[PDB]
Amino acid sequence: WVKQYDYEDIIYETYNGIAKITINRPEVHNAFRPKTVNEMIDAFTKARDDSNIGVIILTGAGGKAFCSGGDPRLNVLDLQRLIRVIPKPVIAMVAGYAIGGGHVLHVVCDLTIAADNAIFGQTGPKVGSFDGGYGAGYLARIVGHKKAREIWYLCRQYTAQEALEMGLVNKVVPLEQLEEETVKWAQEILEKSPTAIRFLKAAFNADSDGLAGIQQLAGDATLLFYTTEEAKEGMRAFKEKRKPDFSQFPRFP
Amino acid sequence: WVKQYDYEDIIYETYNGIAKITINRPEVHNAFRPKTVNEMIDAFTKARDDSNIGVIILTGAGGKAFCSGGDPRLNVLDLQRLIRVIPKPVIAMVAGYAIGGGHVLHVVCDLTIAADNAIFGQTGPKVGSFDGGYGAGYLARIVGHKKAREIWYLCRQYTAQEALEMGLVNKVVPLEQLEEETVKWAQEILEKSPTAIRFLKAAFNADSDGLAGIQQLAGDATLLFYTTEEAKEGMRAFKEKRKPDFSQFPRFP
Amino acid sequence: PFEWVKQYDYEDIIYETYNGIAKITINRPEVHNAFRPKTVNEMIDAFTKARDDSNIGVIILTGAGGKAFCSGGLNVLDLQRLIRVIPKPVIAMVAGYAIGGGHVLHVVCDLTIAADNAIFGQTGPKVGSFDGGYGAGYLARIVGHKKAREIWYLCRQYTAQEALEMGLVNKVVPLEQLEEETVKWAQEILEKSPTAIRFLKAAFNADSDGLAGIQQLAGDATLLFYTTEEAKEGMRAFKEKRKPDFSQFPRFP
């Protein structure tokens, strides 16, 4: 990993197309405060524009904590949306605690790889808080409504195996092989058509986000369209102060 | 448990913040007729209005039947909606049969704790009936479309263990421990912030019910708003006949 | 046992009927039952034939050999919609490979019965393509977003047992008993109300297809309504050049 920029509350490194973002607050079990969130925003954005990065990993430094949520601007919501809009798969690498806002964060990541020591759960109803956005509805679109309501109403803790069984995480491995497996998964992704991946991610987002999700799927198509010759004719003619000729191009039943 | 009002087909009892509504027709496996549904709507309404009650348990009497379903009018549909709109978590405590209309009832309940003798399944297609509302789509949002379509199309019966494995119920325990476990889960919820829970339940309902769901979520936000200094300024400035002063209060944002 | 009656003449497929059951077999084992425009067109035709045959109440889709259901390839998009609009349950009988477009086909079928040798998976981002329609959102509505995004991003293969465990298929049995089991399930559906079934299937589709799903659900309501005295009066009165009298029919709440 090559430490790429200089952050305070987190760490940003890269390697062979993979970008890893690490919350670094083991003292408070990698909890997040307004500042550390803003840094994650900047970092993801950095990875977003970096055409050499095709996959992103999110993890905690502790070794026994991924994130435990936060310590009065609700900027994590902005990060949740960002993680979903980035046209690149985001893998949450979970070790130890993934609680509260921290659990919602691993939830919105495309995939989650957990160490056998990982602990999952919400805390809101206990400490006077709640995430009724992706934290509720999207979670229910992963584990189903009975389990999602259980998770929020009782605020119990769930081990990796429990998480795996309910479809909350994609895989569980010993703590010592966590990053090894995660990088393995990241590389497999780096071998696929990047455009085919961004389109599917958008399609998955459109599944639950109405027009917001359609803006993403339709947006990507607009991007791809500007690539075609047909599209070129459009702005070419505009510049040439003439009427464009699309008949030159084909249709498709 | 302390019994209060006098219902004929059901029993209403409360205990340290828990309201337990019991369908009392063991001779027909706690199947429901218009009368018993009307009373359940009444009882659920009483539990709704009791500021001491925070969780509601729904169950059947006698050990081998939660509810066998319906014995014109289809008032259970009104009950399903009430169950979902009440700001308090409702737990289906299933012992034995939860069939047909009865199965949909345990389904719309937030959580379900089942005894090892519990039997699950739909019967509509067999007996000339069907529930394509929460009975279909919502069931699919718990067990998945493949499993949900299987349940309705073949109308087979499922064990408690099979129900657990597909995510249909939250927990399974021997018949002798059912109520203790259910009460235990209820008390755990009773230790949480009532407002946190109602907002979470509304958000979950908003995930699948469009505007009807948003009305619940937005409505709670209004109730909450009425508790602020900002809103009261408007109410009083509407009682004092003077242009309200809102710049007085902060922006978050 | 079962003697299928081949009923037409197709090049890439085979259409046979037993007794209430229609079976459509992709017959291009040389390319692991991969489909080309023609085989898709032939499937559209065959499914349409099963749709109009009032003696068919269930449909089976399968691959010719015992090592492939379909291995994949747009007009297949029309097929997907057809399989869903047809008011009869469709059962994918999977032996061997169910990959790429072939995996989506089994996915959209109401139920899936797989042989222990069945293999499932997507190959979109590997072979240059993707299915962001039912291929993504609907799959997510079966196995959850975490798993669905995993299936598409890594394009790995999944055994019959792994597909069962994640709710992707309904049942798994030894290769030699595949049809026997499938037919068994089909005959169970056949003894159910055809009308109750079509309404539930329509309701399931309405769960995720907005106005398109509602068109199907309302459409069946319309069809039913036509066989009522109330409706016939409106018709009769129109033919008799007189104003209708619906007062002779009961209101209901």
Automatic annotation (TrEMBL), chain C:
The keyword Lyase applies. Its cofactor is hydrogencarbonate. HAMAP family: MenB. Belongs to the enoyl-CoA hydratase/isomerase family. MenB subfamily. It comes from Geobacillus kaustophilus (strain HTA426). CDD domains: crotonase-like. Converts o-succinylbenzoyl-CoA (OSB-CoA) to 1,4-dihydroxy-2-naphthoyl-CoA (DHNA-CoA). Hydrogencarbonate binds at Q122, T123, G124. This is 1,4-dihydroxy-2-naphthoyl-CoA synthase. InterPro entries: ClpP/crotonase-like_dom_sf, DHNA-CoA_synthase_MenB, Enoyl-CoA_hyd/isom_CS, Enoyl-CoA_hydra/iso, Enoyl-CoA_hydra_C. It holds the Pfam family ECH_1. Its EC number is 4.1.3.36. GO terms for cellular component: cytosol. Keywords: Lyase, Menaquinone biosynthesis. GO terms for biological process: menaquinone biosynthetic process. The gene is menB. The record marks Y226 as: Important for catalysis. GO terms for molecular function: 1,4-dihydroxy-2-naphthoyl-CoA synthase activity. It is an enzyme of class 4 (lyase). Substrate binds at S71, G72, G73, Y97, A98, I99, G100, G101, T123, S129, Y226, K241. Pathway: Quinol/quinone metabolism; 1,4-dihydroxy-2-naphthoate biosynthesis; 1,4-dihydroxy-2-naphthoate from chorismate: step 6/7; Quinol/quinone metabolism; menaquinone biosynthesis. It catalyses: 2-succinylbenzoyl-CoA + H(+) = 1,4-dihydroxy-2-naphthoyl-CoA + H2O.
